[PDB]
Design an enzyme around this catalytic site. Structure first.
Site, PDB file in Angstrom:
ATOM      1  N   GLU A  71     -10.285   6.729   3.881  1.00 34.01           N
ATOM      2  CA  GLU A  71     -11.160   5.818   4.591  1.00 34.01           C
ATOM      3  C   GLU A  71     -10.391   4.525   4.781  1.00 34.01           C
ATOM      4  OE1 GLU A  71     -11.830   3.114   2.303  1.00 34.01           O
ATOM      5  OE2 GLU A  71     -10.713   4.288   0.828  1.00 34.01           O
ATOM      6  N   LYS A  87       0.825  -1.244   0.000  1.00 32.73           N
ATOM      7  CA  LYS A  87       0.000   0.000   0.000  1.00 32.73           C
ATOM      8  C   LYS A  87       0.826   1.247   0.000  1.00 32.73           C
ATOM      9  CE  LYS A  87      -4.298  -1.645   2.110  1.00 32.73           C
ATOM     10  NZ  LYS A  87      -3.827  -3.040   2.218  1.00 32.73           N
ATOM     11  N   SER A 100       2.276  -9.768  -0.542  1.00 32.69           N
ATOM     12  CA  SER A 100       1.865  -8.373  -0.474  1.00 32.69           C
ATOM     13  C   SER A 100       2.110  -7.732   0.892  1.00 32.69           C
ATOM     14  CB  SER A 100       0.388  -8.240  -0.861  1.00 32.69           C
ATOM     15  OG  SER A 100      -0.404  -9.154  -0.128  1.00 32.69           O
TER      16      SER A 100
END
Lengths: 255, 395, 395, 255
Positions: free
Chosen positions: C108, C86, C376
């Site tokens: 969010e 991310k 990930s």
């Protein structure tokens, strides 16, 4: 060491091996420890090996680790141990007394001053458990300048080069802890080592006789005595009776 | 008789029971052979690069230094696999053990980070791993204990003495004196009997080697000082080693000051200890007046080694390196400052080093100086500890 | 009128209230300008390299594949700053916002990982950051909430509707429709109204670009398949994008199967959903028969997006990529397997991708195949979740 | 839209603006909702705007968000909403009825079938809140094929190119939500847009008169009605009385 020399000459004249118990000074309390030691001597111990309680016993099994904890619990300090030693010697002038120390207690206030203090109270020998022969020079030199015998452990994984150094550097006796025992004993005799005491797991009268028959001048009971203390903590009177019976059995086994 | 000098000036040595000396000598010889072996170096470098994530970044911190003439970089060992610099040297020691033909790994741990590092290295390389840990430390570090068990390590709780690092370390040494034929003892810092202070340094020195090349590339000059926190001393000596001969580079080690040196509850043996003999070495240590070994205290459990590596004592004595202390409160503030202005959550250990840098900057804000801080780990492990303290202060 | 095609075949679009369309058009234009600007690329690349830790390693997993003809590599996004992929794209979006002259960031988050990533990026670049979060998610993720507050982010709990991601997302969009003059909305995955599916892909495509170069260097050939888990789809499209034109490379996306597809409690909209219109896009989604949006379920909260990015729906429809599902239990086992045999603790999200690779290997153990799994994230965040489940099973 | 055309012609003949309340269908229950709507009409509402409850109202404030939650709590579904709409029309044949929808409810069973179902029950217009004009083609084309007026929102951040598309694509009325209102109203008149209703925060009789005086053909009360419902949940009888007084005040303000 002069006490050791006299001890071994007398024992040879009687075709007799030495039996040497080990206890921690001040376990389980100062007064009870002094009673224990008097009991071991009356029951025929030929010499004593005494431990000074240390915080980090890096070379000790759990039985002795707990013994140190009890002594610490009872407020025992190095200074108190030395007062105990002067009292023991005053009561028993001829028995050899050896200390089992850790290096930091020896080093703390000066190596030379520690061995001077041993000489003053009448200690005969010092084994420093975490000083190998390779690092031993300042310790054995201070020992000899104050007429203290430096004791070295001759380990199972020993080799011939270690054997010559132990034989050459030690005095009083050689602490015996691969290589068939018999050989080890004759090699040490060849190099003129101090008499060898077997110290690995001596806990029954039969091992005592086996060690003496194998060439050893005697045996050190490294932890069997401390167990009897730990078994009978709640009944000091029973502690002493079990100690007197065990020691006199071991001593009988050495003749 | 050793191949290498076991002393740094007067500090160091091999103060172990006679029974352990064959094990240390066999280890010193294997190390010296491995150091000359290009095949060993290429395998080590391959694991560091393709498994652990080296080289780590060198991050400039403009936000923190704004309005001063300090330029600050962080050597990012928090980005290493496992989240701390410890990974570098467990991989070296695990390869060394395989080279010696060993198949079991013995380790001890307090806060659990060296336990985790030993377990991940053993899992990767197919070694059987047993870890001794103080029962009081086991209770306080259930996360790290679970990690170790997930990675296949046997965690042996020790119900003896004070149930702290000391009983485990002593139990680990005792274990090793019986098993050294098949087992290697993976000591967790740059202390202990020779050759461990030397080995752990050499398996951490890539930290300072990368830092030198990276700072030369980015600024064209060597730093004015490199700053690292000091527990037993492995991350600091890893940062320092390649700068020792660059005498214009200050070397600054930071010890925990706890609640304060004057209070007695700290962990600065190098500056407020006394030379003694413990854990196989002659070094400054924290001890009572009649020579029992004291526990060190710090908000960061990772800095609670009651002594220090002998090469640090040596560097202090000759004046090549300077050693200061930083209190708990100074470390927490540096923790908050890094979170808020750079988006990096540092280990509370590493926060001591950062705090001293922030002090050098803030006390003399017009002094031009190029500083590198070794950010030895990330602080996800400390998030709860910091939270409880911040709540207990109404924050 | 847009500069770029907002559709992937029939999927995608810009299904937002009219009031929001100036904001999307202004964003598309800034993105297209930034993509052509070498200065933008050099700043982005510098942050990725010197702050986030790129390039990440490509780790071969011999231990796991022993006794098969599968060769397995892990692309190590768990080593990235922040512990998950991310980070790559929040840094791009935060730079883009500064380029547009914005000074506030709106985001969010559900499980909190995108909240943490948005907050660290805003702290680094000097942006004011507010994060909307469902009050039910706030309770369950106090660690991540504390992290966000340490980094200076305002965490706005939402006491509306179901108190889940949906109320926050909807509150974040509502906020942005009033504030877009000064604020940028940092969407957390490769879904939503155009141009977000396109932007998030381009700010993640270095994952697959590095993987191609690293596999060519290490094996001399392209992989037979690249495997990535699919929530909203950003890490998968990041891995896939540079291989799309290499038609001999299989592309395999892994959706959560939850307790099982047949039970109804899962998170596989791509394969067991129906095209709908929600969150600004036309895409497969999980919905009731009369068209209300359903919650997706998974042991991994990070895979609980009730839809999927429109480029994935497009790739499935033309047969360029294949999408499978993996259950909770399959994912936990892969989690344990990686811990025990490689010393890497993976995120439970990433464990779904690993589990499918292990299945391909184990079902056909004599098939020769070169597989790459996109790892990930790291799984320190999942240690408690895994522990409680393992205890509830007597393990 | 034919109903809208008739409505506005009559209102122009009386120099009168339209007042259009909004409510969610089925809030707070089916039977009470039908009573609310009958009350609003008796009190002089000129037309209705009705919402169909949706799970993710991405374009709605908190007042309407809670209204949807109550309707969901009461078991309201799209199918139930359409039965309600047939009943409302049967009772009030001439009042224009507009739906406020979200795209997924329109798309779910086919865009064309949704507008066919609106035509069957007698709905006059549909506003899809999350379909901008740029994406509106399949929706407005289905609307026109079934004689439904497509309503578009003309936002504050509107520009001239949007104004021409809204004027060209919408029917029935234009939903008005920068640029001085007056201008917006004359530009839309220039482009021949459907009559503009002001819909931004109309909550007092004074804003209603201000909108009509500024050129708007009337006003939509986007949430003030739903608040009165939320205030009087515990007393349905008081709810109706407050609704009848508010609406009749707003309607008076438009003459």
């Amino acid at each position: 060491m002069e006490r050791y020399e006299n001890l071994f000459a007398q024992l040879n004249d009687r075709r007799e091996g030495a039996f040497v118990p080990f206890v921690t000074l001040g376990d389980p309390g100062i007064e009870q420890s002094l009673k224990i030691i008097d009991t071991l001597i009356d029951a025929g111990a030929d010499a004593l090996e005494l431990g000074v309680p240390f915080s980090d016993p890096l070379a000790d099994g759990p039985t002795i680790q707990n013994a140190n904890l009890r002594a610490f619990a009872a407020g025992v300090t190095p200074a108190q141990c030395f007062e105990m030693l002067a009292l023991i010697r005053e009561k028993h002038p001829t028995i050899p007394i050896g200390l089992l120390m850790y290096a930091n207690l020896v080093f703390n206030n000066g190596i030379d001053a520690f061995y001077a203090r041993c000489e003053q109270v009448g200690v005969d020998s010092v084994l420093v458990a975490d000083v190998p022969v390779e690092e031993s020079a300042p310790f054995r030199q201070a020992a000899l300048r104050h007429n203290i015998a430096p004791i070295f452990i001759c380990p199972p994984n020993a080799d011939d080069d270690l054997l010559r150094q132990v034989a050459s550097y030690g005095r009083g006796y050689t602490y015996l802890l691969a290589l068939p025992l018999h050989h080890l004993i004759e090699k040490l005799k060849e190099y003129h080592a101090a008499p060898a005491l077997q110290g690995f797991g001596i806990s029954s009268p039969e091992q005592v006789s086996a060690a003496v028959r194998a060439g050893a001048a005697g045996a050190i009971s490294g932890s069997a005595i401390v167990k009897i203390i730990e078994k009978n903590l709640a009944s000091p009177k029973q502690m002493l009776a079990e100690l007197r019976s065990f020691v006199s059995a071991m001593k009988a086994a050495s003749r | 008789t050793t191949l290498l000098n076991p002393y740094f000036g007067e500090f160091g040595g091999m103060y172990v029971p006679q029974i352990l000396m064959p094990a240390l000598n066999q280890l010193e010889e294997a190390f010296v052979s491995a150091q000359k072996d290009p095949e060993f170096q290429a395998q080590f470098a391959d694991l560091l690069k393709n498994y652990a994530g080296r080289p780590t970044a060198l991050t400039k911190c403009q936000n923190i230094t704004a309005g001063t003439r300090t330029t600050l970089y962080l050597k990012r060992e928090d980005l290493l696999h496992g989240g701390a610099h410890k990974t570098n040297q467990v991989l070296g020691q695990a390869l060394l053990a395989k080279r010696m033909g060993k198949s079991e790994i013995i380790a001890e741990t307090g806060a659990g980070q060296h336990g985790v590092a030993s377990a991940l290295a053993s899992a990767l390389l197919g070694l059987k791993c047993r870890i001794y840990m103080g029962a009081k430390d086991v209770e306080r570090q259930s996360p790290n204990v679970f990690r170790m068990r997930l990675m296949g390590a046997e965690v042996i709780p020790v119900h003896s003495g004070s149930a702290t690092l000391k009983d485990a370390c002593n139990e680990a040494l005792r274990d090793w004196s019986g098993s050294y034929e098949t087992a290697h003892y993976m000591l967790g810092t740059a202390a202990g009997p020779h050759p461990y202070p030397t080995i752990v340094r050499e398996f951490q020195r890539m930290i300072g080697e990368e830092t030198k090349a990276q700072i030369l590339d980015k600024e064209g000059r060597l730093p004015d000082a490199v700053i690292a926190c000091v527990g037993g001393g492995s991350n600091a000596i890893g940062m320092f080693a390649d700068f020792i001969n660059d005498t214009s580079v200050g070397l600054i080690g930071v010890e925990p000051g706890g609640h304060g040196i004057e209070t007695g509850e700290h962990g600065a043996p190098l500056k407020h200890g006394r030379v003694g003999i413990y854990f196989g070495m002659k070094a400054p240590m924290m001890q009572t007046a009649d020579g029992q070994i004291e526990e060190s205290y710090s908000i960061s459990a990772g800095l609670d080694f009651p002594s220090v590596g002998p090469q640090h004592a040596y560097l202090n004595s000759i004046g090549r390196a300077d050693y200061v202390s930083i209190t708990d409160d100074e470390a927490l503030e540096a923790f908050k400052t890094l979170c808020r202005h750079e988006g990096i959550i540092p280990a509370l250990e590493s926060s001591h080093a950062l705090a001293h840098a922030l002090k050098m900057m803030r006390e003399q804000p017009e002094k031009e100086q190029l500083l590198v801080v070794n950010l030895s780990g990330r602080g996800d492990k400390d998030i709860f500890t910091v939270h409880d303290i911040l709540k207990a202060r109404g924050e």
